[PDB]
């Protein structure tokens, strides 16, 4: 009956005539609560996964914080209006339309230095829960190979550096044309060069969310 419901949020969402409440780890009526914790209002938050694990210093990365009971029952109705996501002392702004009681989505702000083991604090009105697995990284391109290629494009361009797999998405480009990705990793980004109509040199520009990174010029030989 009342134990049909599995989460604290779902438990307090049950219709009033059923008279269900949350008893620490179980949804049950008050007469069967054996701890002094039975409630129809209180729901403490809990995180178990956060992806992606890291963002470039410029930020712009949209996080996805999976967990339980991120909401707040105001006036006997849950919403995420009381929900606050703190990345350290700054806040990640929530997207309500893509968020729910058990999963949150929020865009991180800028950082000035690298930070490792950053703490994600989430308050839901009743309590707070912490998550120390996030990093502000600073992606760098150490080199590119080869330094030149045909105007036909299709050259296997290898970018080399660190933290090149942080954040939401990679966009390498050269000459204003897209350099289509082959493989992504912390240290290596492989991509095939676009076909140019001009014989000249171009810098290889890498885009990671709001972060921009340039490197050595790449010549298009004729």
């Amino acid at each position, epitope marked *: 009956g009342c134990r049909h419901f599995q989460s604290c949020s779902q438990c307090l969402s049950a219709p009033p005539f059923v008279q269900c409440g949350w008893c620490h780890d179980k949804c049950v009526r008050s007469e069967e609560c054996l701890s002094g914790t039975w409630t129809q209002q209180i729901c403490l938050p809990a995180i178990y996964k956060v992806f992606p694990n890291s963002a470039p210093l410029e930020g712009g990365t949209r996080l996805t914080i999976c967990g339980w009971d991120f909401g707040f029952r105001r006036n006997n*109705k849950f919403d*995420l*209006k009381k929900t606050r996501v703190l990345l350290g002392n700054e806040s990640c*702004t*929530l997207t*309500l*339309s893509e968020s729910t009681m058990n999963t949150l989505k929020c865009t991180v702000g800028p950082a000035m230095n690298k930070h490792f083991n950053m703490s994600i604090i989430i308050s839901n009105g009743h309590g707070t829960t912490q998550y120390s697995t996030f990093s502000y990284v600073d992606p760098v391109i150490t080199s590119i190979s080869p330094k030149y290629g045909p105007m036909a494009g299709g050259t296997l361009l290898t970018l080399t550096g660190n933290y090149l797999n942080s954040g939401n998405s990679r966009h390498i480009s050269i000459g204003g044309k897209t350099c289509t990705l082959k493989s992504v990793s912390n240290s290596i980004l492989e991509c095939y060069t676009p076909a140019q109509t001009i014989s000249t040199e171009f810098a290889v520009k890498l885009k990671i969310d709001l972060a921009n990174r340039e490197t050595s010029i790449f010549s298009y030989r004729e």
Partner: antibody
Amino acid sequence: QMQLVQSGAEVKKPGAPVKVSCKVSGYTFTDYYMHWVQQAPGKGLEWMGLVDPEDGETIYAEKFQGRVTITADTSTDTAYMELSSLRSEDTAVYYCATDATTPYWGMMWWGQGTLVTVSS
Amino acid sequence: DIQMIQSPSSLSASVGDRVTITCQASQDISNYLNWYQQKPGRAPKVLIYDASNLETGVPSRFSGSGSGTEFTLTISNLRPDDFATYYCQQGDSFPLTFGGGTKVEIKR
């Protein structure tokens, strides 16, 4: 129906503080958030920030961060909006608004507005 | 950061016309959008919640539709009191942003 009764028009010198009040009646003041909204002459609506009357929490827009202070007196069912250090730019009608029961943010109820002119 | 873009900024219409007002959002806001009406000298009043639901008291001549990033406010059977400024507003994320406004005016 609900009443958001705001205070009257203001004429402050530049640099002076101003405090606009918003007394409410018709519902329980602590149940809902309270937005404040700015409207410069001939211009659109612009969200300033909000307050949760139940605990006193505030959320400001970046543009008014540090300069505006929204407060809420639960003893008199009144929300205040103080703007320290007025600039000439700050001449505008200021609205207070009750937050909607929708899952998302919205302005359910509105006050009549308060003209704060700023001139030397 | 989410930017609401209304179009047109103004339009002319005779009484009894079907007016249509559009509203673009820079990001997908689902149906988390409100329309307001502001006549000169007065505070705005809510017209529509959830992009399509009329507020209690609003005539059925009004209707909103759209989802994600594109929204409309249609005004069938235009009436003299409908000449006013209309604003869209997203409530999906901070800061809360309004559109630039659409002024409906009497055609002459």
